């Protein structure tokens, strides 16, 4: 319902992104997580986008 | 007001005491841990009990609470 | 394919892939066909003369299938590793 779809984009420039959801109303701060980037095969910071 | 039901889930003991099992075969499907896991038996995320080794299924009752355990005995 | 109004299998599954125009002009040559050619030399034009491949084939590749028991010269055709070994085991040659 309220909880809207976003993508978390790699910070390695590979164009890889994960996709998730976020409640924008509560906790509006941008999401940031160490996720595995398979293009570079390293754990890298992924930042909220879209 | 009462014309509703859910698709039956086909839960239950899929493999009975003493039968031979290959590794990975589901023994019992269950809501909650009605059967607990013992030797060479793994518990799944939805509490499914499956064989972690090739063997024969064995049922037992163990522990202070008289709980039922599924074990696989290597043949 | 009618299933009584249920969405049939072909409309229920997705489309995939594309058709390559390179494939229609590519062809495969078995080792048995290397001795059917006339003159002992192997090439597109002589294979077309011997009726091993169609007139419109522009690319060919010899593969390990059958046996070659005579010296054979190959030119302008790809050859697999096994077919290359088989040709060279019978006193042949391969040229690019």
């Amino acid at each position: 319902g309220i909880r809207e779809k976003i993508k978390l984009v790699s910070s390695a420039g590979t164009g890889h992104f994960y996709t998730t959801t976020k409640n924008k109303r509560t906790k509006p701060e941008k999401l940031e997580l160490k996720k595995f980037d398979p293009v570079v095969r390293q754990h890298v910071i992924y930042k909220e986008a879209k | 007001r009462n014309g509703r039901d859910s698709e039956a889930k086909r839960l239950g003991v899929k493999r009975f005491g003493g039968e031979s099992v290959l590794a990975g075969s589901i023994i019992v499907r269950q809501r909650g841990t009605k059967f607990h896991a013992g030797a060479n038996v793994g518990c799944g995320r939805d509490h499914t009990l499956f064989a972690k080794a090739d063997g024969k299924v064995k049922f037992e009752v163990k522990g202070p609470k008289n709980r039922k355990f599924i074990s696989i005995e290597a043949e | 394919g009618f299933e009584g109004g249920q969405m049939p299998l072909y409309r229920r599954l997705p489309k995939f892939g594309f058709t390559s125009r390179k494939a229609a002009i590519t062809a495969e040559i078995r080792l048995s066909d290397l001795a059917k050619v006339e003159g002992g030399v192997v090439d597109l034009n002589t294979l077309k003369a011997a009726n091993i491949i169609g007139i419109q084939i522009e690319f060919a590749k010899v593969i390990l299938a059958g046996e070659v028991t005579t010296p054979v010269t190959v030119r302008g055709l790809r050859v697999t590793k096994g077919a290359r070994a088989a040709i060279e085991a019978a006193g042949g040659k391969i040229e690019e």
Partner: protein
């Protein structure tokens, strides 16, 4: 006259070596965030048409 191929099936199926038909899986086109990565990874490869559907596919693809 020649039998006419069903072109949707001609786009959906390909014949294999032993006579079966391969196809791409359904449910991997557009509501992908909620689906588990395990499910999509298992859907990605191709699959063989089943016995119940082989007759329909063969009727649709006479010249395959």
């Amino acid at each position: 006259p020649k039998i006419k191929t069903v072109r949707g099936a001609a786009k959906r199926f390909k014949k294999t070596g032993k006579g079966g038909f391969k196809h791409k899986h359904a449910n991997l086109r557009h509501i992908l965030t909620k689906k588990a990565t395990k499910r999509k990874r298992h859907l990605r490869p191709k699959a063989m048409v089943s016995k119940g559907d082989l007759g329909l596919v063969i009727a649709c693809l006479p010249y395959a």
